[PDB]
Motif scaffolding. Sequence first.
Motif, PDB file in Angstrom:
ATOM      1  N   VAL A 105       1.137   6.077   8.948  1.00  0.00           N
ATOM      2  CA  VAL A 105       1.085   7.719   8.799  1.00  0.00           C
ATOM      3  C   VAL A 105       0.676   8.107   7.382  1.00  0.00           C
ATOM      4  O   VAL A 105       1.485   7.719   6.555  1.00  0.00           O
ATOM      5  CB  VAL A 105       2.067   8.465   9.697  1.00  0.00           C
ATOM      6  N   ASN A 106      -0.130   9.020   7.135  1.00  0.00           N
ATOM      7  CA  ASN A 106      -0.344   9.861   6.146  1.00  0.00           C
ATOM      8  C   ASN A 106       0.448  10.945   5.922  1.00  0.00           C
ATOM      9  O   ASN A 106       0.203  11.836   6.823  1.00  0.00           O
ATOM     10  CB  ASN A 106      -1.744  10.237   5.844  1.00  0.00           C
ATOM     11  N   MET A 107       1.324  10.827   5.337  1.00  0.00           N
ATOM     12  CA  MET A 107       2.275  12.028   5.062  1.00  0.00           C
ATOM     13  C   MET A 107       2.288  12.875   3.645  1.00  0.00           C
ATOM     14  O   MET A 107       1.644  12.244   2.881  1.00  0.00           O
ATOM     15  CB  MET A 107       3.760  11.529   5.121  1.00  0.00           C
ATOM     16  N   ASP A 145       2.317   7.342   1.903  1.00  0.00           N
ATOM     17  CA  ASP A 145       1.897   6.554   3.035  1.00  0.00           C
ATOM     18  C   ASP A 145       3.108   5.777   3.729  1.00  0.00           C
ATOM     19  O   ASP A 145       3.809   5.133   3.024  1.00  0.00           O
ATOM     20  CB  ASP A 145       0.945   5.494   2.405  1.00  0.00           C
ATOM     21  N   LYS A 187      -6.256  13.843   7.639  1.00  0.00           N
ATOM     22  CA  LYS A 187      -5.366  14.845   6.907  1.00  0.00           C
ATOM     23  C   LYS A 187      -6.241  15.558   5.745  1.00  0.00           C
ATOM     24  O   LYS A 187      -6.459  15.011   4.687  1.00  0.00           O
ATOM     25  CB  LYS A 187      -4.302  14.269   6.640  1.00  0.00           C
ATOM     26  N   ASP A 214      -7.676  12.254   3.784  1.00  0.00           N
ATOM     27  CA  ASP A 214      -7.204  10.990   3.793  1.00  0.00           C
ATOM     28  C   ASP A 214      -6.920  10.497   5.455  1.00  0.00           C
ATOM     29  O   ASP A 214      -6.510  11.293   6.050  1.00  0.00           O
ATOM     30  CB  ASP A 214      -5.732  10.762   3.077  1.00  0.00           C
ATOM     31  N   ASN A 238      -5.956   6.756   8.172  1.00  0.00           N
ATOM     32  CA  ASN A 238      -5.519   5.838   8.498  1.00  0.00           C
ATOM     33  C   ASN A 238      -6.734   5.309   9.533  1.00  0.00           C
ATOM     34  O   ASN A 238      -6.517   5.592  10.861  1.00  0.00           O
ATOM     35  CB  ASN A 238      -4.101   5.669   9.177  1.00  0.00           C
ATOM     36  N   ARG A 263      -9.815   7.330   1.530  1.00  0.00           N
ATOM     37  CA  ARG A 263      -9.533   8.613   0.683  1.00  0.00           C
ATOM     38  C   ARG A 263     -10.871   9.163   0.462  1.00  0.00           C
ATOM     39  O   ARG A 263     -11.651   8.402  -0.394  1.00  0.00           O
ATOM     40  CB  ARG A 263      -8.772   7.856  -0.455  1.00  0.00           C
ATOM     41  N   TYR A 308      -3.459  23.122   4.430  1.00  0.00           N
ATOM     42  CA  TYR A 308      -3.328  21.861   4.772  1.00  0.00           C
ATOM     43  C   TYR A 308      -3.794  21.660   6.468  1.00  0.00           C
ATOM     44  O   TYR A 308      -3.060  22.389   7.233  1.00  0.00           O
ATOM     45  CB  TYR A 308      -1.668  21.383   4.710  1.00  0.00           C
TER      46      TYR A 308
END
Lengths: 225, 225
Positions: free
Chosen positions: A159-161, A174, B147, B158, B160, B176, B190
């Motif tokens: 997960v992109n946090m 990450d 995201k 970004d 995954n 990215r 966001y």
Amino acid sequence: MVSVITSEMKIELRMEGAVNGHKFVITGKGSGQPFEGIQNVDLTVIEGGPLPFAFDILTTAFXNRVFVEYPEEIVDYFKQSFPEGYSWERSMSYEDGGICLATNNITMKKDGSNCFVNEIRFDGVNFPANGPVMQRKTVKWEPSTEKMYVRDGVLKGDVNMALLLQGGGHYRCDFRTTYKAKKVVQLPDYHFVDHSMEITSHDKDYNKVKLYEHAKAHSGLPRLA
Amino acid sequence: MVSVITSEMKIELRMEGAVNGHKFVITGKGSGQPFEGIQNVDLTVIEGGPLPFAFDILTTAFXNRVFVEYPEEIVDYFKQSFPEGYSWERSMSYEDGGICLATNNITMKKDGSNCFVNEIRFDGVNFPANGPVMQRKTVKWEPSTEKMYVRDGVLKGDVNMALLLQGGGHYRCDFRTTYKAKKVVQLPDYHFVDHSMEITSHDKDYNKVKLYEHAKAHSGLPRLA
Ligand code: NA
Ligand code: NA
């Protein structure tokens, strides 16, 4: 197979760890609704307080993927694993080179009650002295969507946090987690878990912190509009 | 501000690039519905065919974030940028060390028509000879949730990503992207963009490929169940 998950379950946890060499111990008690994917936990720093780093870096280690609303069509790796339980291992890589690893061994309380026992280890290194973690400039983690996929007979979740920072902007991290059931369970197809976790209350130095999480699984956006 | 986006818009593109030194040129024509977040494109390899690598690695460079259903409450960085347009830059890092970079400069066709012109550059290196990219063992990209977050007055995204492989299992890639409007536009908070992109038709060697994408923006899971 037979599930022992009930609609209301308790939580007990103990985290021991170190961040840039600063040792700490934190215990917590809470409760959740596994089928609704919501949970609460009250945390207390019993050793190492006041913590010199942002409390936010620890919170996803505390607020267990059993607390996710899984639809019927998606295999629930987590709820199948009980009573034996499961463990997880995670790397959390921050964009400024800071890195944390954490593990959680999740089992049922030995007295037979409806309580999850969490044994957590947390370790962090290479946080810059003037970064937002060491200067405690984080506000919260944004919500996120974790990508779940099977690898080598176990489940991975990436997960992109992002931490929203004081004064605006985000600080990226990450996550790479590996979940391992303590018995053979049915493996899911590729899927997603949306999360929204927040600190709902804390004291000035974060010796006392209350956490809430809501999580729900899904299969992504359907192709048809 | 004033938007020139219409419900039905055409697409023209040209990609030039190289993967492990193998040069190629691919052109495409299509159409989309920007407000519904859906689009189609028909691609033709005009130089470098038959491609020795998995066509899937190129597809997200072809199927432009203008084709996303943005709700009213979320600022649409992309639709505001027209007619001037915007560009994007992306790194795509595969778990086996293979890496691709791509750019797209997106403007309106010089004849005044409702057509997006895409000038794409794509470059890839360090793909292992026996990996799924060079052996062409990929099936499709799974759906994903990108995201979106502002950084230095521009928008970053970004995601995954995962390629499902022939015989099962997934091959992970971290994207990215940096999106840059060609004029001052309002910046979003966001947020997330769910995507579902697939090859709907192809010839044996992927000299002719038809792509479809559906994308929709959101703010994540609400805290209340
Ligand atoms: Na349609
Ligand atoms: Na509730």
